[model samples]
Target: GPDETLSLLADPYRFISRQCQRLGANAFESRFLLKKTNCLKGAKAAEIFYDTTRFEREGAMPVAIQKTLLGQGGVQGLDGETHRHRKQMFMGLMTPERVRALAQLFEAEWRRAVPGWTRKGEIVFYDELHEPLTRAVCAWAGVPLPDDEAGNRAGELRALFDAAGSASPRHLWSRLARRRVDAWAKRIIEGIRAGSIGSGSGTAAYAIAWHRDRHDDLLSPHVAAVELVNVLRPTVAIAVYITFVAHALQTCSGIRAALVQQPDYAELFVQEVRRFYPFFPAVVARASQDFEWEGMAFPEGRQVVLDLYGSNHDAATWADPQEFRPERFRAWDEDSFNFIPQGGGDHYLGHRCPGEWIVLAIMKVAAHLLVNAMRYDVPDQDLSIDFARLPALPKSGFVMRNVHIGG
Candidate 1:
């Protein structure tokens, strides 16, 4: 399976697509990470995969990913009543007013960040946005990240996603960062308990710190820290989407011009960027019980991977799947099972990302900033992204020059 795994890595974004093509079906049986894995694509597959009665997240994430991208005992790993209760903590913070507030925080960060970029003359959007996103989310979540430590903290958050699918050095660094951030979060939780930390009572940190489990006792500090990182890490990772937005606006002329004329296009453009570009490659779960679908048998405890990227681009669910067309979203059917750049399912009840609304809000604000509030020159550099690189970015980090805000 070395040759097959290498091919998957070689075309990380298209791994499942190729498998489905080769098997002449929407689902295929393969071995991933040395385990027999069932990979599924298309909307029907997603509907089945996300049905909690059929699949669960326990032991689904690889050890490396658990240590880095998804800390243990977080919402991403839970099932049933326990999962819904914990997910409510996250969803509670995503009220329309709170999401609007989050967008304002992101917009404030971008405005503060842009002026500094103009001075640098040449800046990499991917690297440059991390610190301010860190600051924004820290303040928004009521976690204290001193300005002096923001860069390091931001790098640690980035490391979680950056090293998730890597090996050795990067993976090792991600683990270390996880340890440090967890310790930092533990201390904050302790302070919140002792009335030493000033995280507002309503803030996410304060909420998580005080949140009780099914047993009606406060969460252990370590677990609280893990959940806090869940909020902070993914929000800061929105910097990745900001980079994608910048890349898309500069490269896709028609979409860019559409936004320049109509602000309503921002949502459409952001959705297409999410669908066209890769975010997570797949969502994994284990069979909850023996089941059969589409003539495929799934035994209890079998591993299954729902192809997130492939589903977004599946020709069966989308028209002109190869094109980067924002207009397609204008009349979209709003199906949750398809176009799942995050994951497919009902957010409050299923494994779909709770922070997805926050993601879209951040991207929409960033889109407006890119289209109406700024102009920059994409220098003649290699604008290509490596499909093999997990959580991919442009080769030059999307080098830009003459970066300035509107007149």
Candidate 2:
């Protein structure tokens, strides 16, 4: 009955928090994109939002989102045992060995890129980080990218997340990019089946190609390609977090030396960046059936969007939620529902992003690089984030001038 979609677009990160405060409630009624949506926030609300029996994913996303970000028929669109089966394909890759491999791959990319940045003497970091992440993830996932084409392919992969929540020309471009990548991925899937693409057995590409659903049938080529992007795109998208880490390093320079000596310090910093910045705004689902949450009606099939940004900044859960304090993590007991920069709830049981650990691992490596391995000057440019921007970044993408490997 109430419309706040434009307000949401206006301040993509804090809309839910501002609304909850305005309404004097943790949940409120609102219309989003002309749909009667119930906006819910906080850890308790997240617990209910992620309950598989009470909510489901199918038809929850708008067709535009499916076209631009998440492809149709991917794991994000599945539920129940079928969802779990497909999820395992992603979750399995998080093994300690694979996790180590991912970190190693990222480190190698960084090692390779540092020299070029030093020679170049100036860089928009957000742009610089994408190429290495794209190369690393493709290699790790068994997706092959020709050296000549890595930058272009990375741009396409980045577009999926960059344009997922935007309007107009960018969104149209993202849709076109999705079509191109999807077709390319479908061919890769076919190559895997034909043993032509040597992604090697037991990697993400191999697993997705071979992954059988509950019906014991392999996913269609289009769906398989969607799943492949699910793996590759997000890993490349971690460059966003790396950009945030660079911003944090520039803003919080005192921590640089500490992060260099104690690599473990990166964990707390990464957690804070994940919490403080605007990554994704919410996770969506549809009410499976009639239910009551905190005395409010959740009618069957109604759209429910759990406010991830609101929960992460909830004053009730974190003291001084707005403050960028990594030390807050020193006492964090790791409540899965409360601090969800990514999605909340159990990684294995609910809708939490499975690659979250990999995000942390890569960020920690990034921290070590920024602190221990390199130094740069933050040029005179805009550093403030545009809150209205979906997947918001510094207005200038955090430019670093004279970047070189040193103390």
Candidate 3:
């Protein structure tokens, strides 16, 4: 067929799975951006997609994504021993103690915002979340953020991921945001190195500022800045997931009660939100060498798109995949490949997002606060999510009214 770029744009979240279903195959060949592309879905496909020896991330991401979602020269685009070394840099910052610290910071920020929220007649929960998340992550990562600047910084950071996958002119705004954020981060890294900044010794800012590559040399200022934004960008992006969490609490049946009754159920609810909702639609890679799988041939250098959203909703792996049931996770065996909201496979080894722990931690805090710490009325609005939107979200951005703290 002709280029499917427009089709993918029209239905990004379901593009791959829909094609696979129509073709009656787990994988199919197509063209995107006028280049030969192979699309894959399901657990087995995810397993293959993460095999480092067969696929590599270098040169796999399109230029648009690099300019916005991921900056150039970051770990996401690295491969081989170099990739592993950079991956270690991220893993080091995710130690259990640090994760807990970030979670606590997020909880405190949420609580601090609650009193102010109660005073407002109404609030857009999604819009309101960006500042708290920005403040919490910046503090936890050892980046200096003034109280008055939090909202502006948060908007810029949000744009990095929010407009990343756009085909419209909003994408230009993402590029602009990337440029501004990069410049800001570069100054911070330089300040840290010059003893002008006071980042904690164990903080992400300090770690990335001082992190050495396999060559035993510190990353250049630009690369260091990109790495720092890598930390800040994704943590702020969790606001999207948190918004979906609030969406579920309002729309999904019995979720609020379940979260209130069973403290541990928050994890299940968060997982369901991740699985059922759309965040990143897919991850792309290229064949490292000529290979064949399941009687299909893959030429070296062919781009492969793994359908993340499709895999999570695959009926073969998930019973009643369309239903919003957290109880399904009760028996989930935790197959790495089967449920990849962030990429699949080993976080320390493969390209799976190292920030997964942070996402879970912050999300749990948000869920707990929304359930036990505050009460609000979800006003009537369009709660429907636009699947076509990159990093899909509700049309209304989730409005809440008459918020009362300590409900």
RMSD of each: 1.5, 1.4, 1.1
Ranking according to lDDT, highest score first: 3, 2, 1
- lDDT by residue for model 3 over 236-310, one digit each (tens)? 999899999998888888998889999779889989998999898999999999999998888999899999999
- lDDT of all predictions, in order shown? 0.86, 0.87, 0.91
Decreasing TM-score order of the candidates: 3, 2, 1
Error of 3 at 171 (Å): 1.4
Q: Which regions of candidate 2 fall more than 4 Å away from where they truly are?
A: none
- What residue runs in model 1 are displaced by over 4 Å at the alpha carbon? 1-3
- Over the stretch 1-407, how does candidate 1's per-residue lDDT look in tens digits? 33366677777888898879888899977786667778899999999998989999877877777788878778888899999999999888888888888789878988988889999999988989888888888998999888799889999998988877785599898998888888998898999999999888768999999999999999999999999999999998888788888888777767777888886878888889899988788888999999998999899988998888889988877868988898899779889898899888798889888888899999998888887787888879877776778887777778888999965
What TM-scores do the predictions have? 0.97, 0.97, 0.98
TM-score of 2: 0.97
RMSD of 3: 1.1
State residue 206's C-alpha deviation in candidate 1, in Å.
1.0
For candidate 3, what is the TM-score?
0.98
Residue runs of model 3 more than 4 Å from their true location after superposition: none
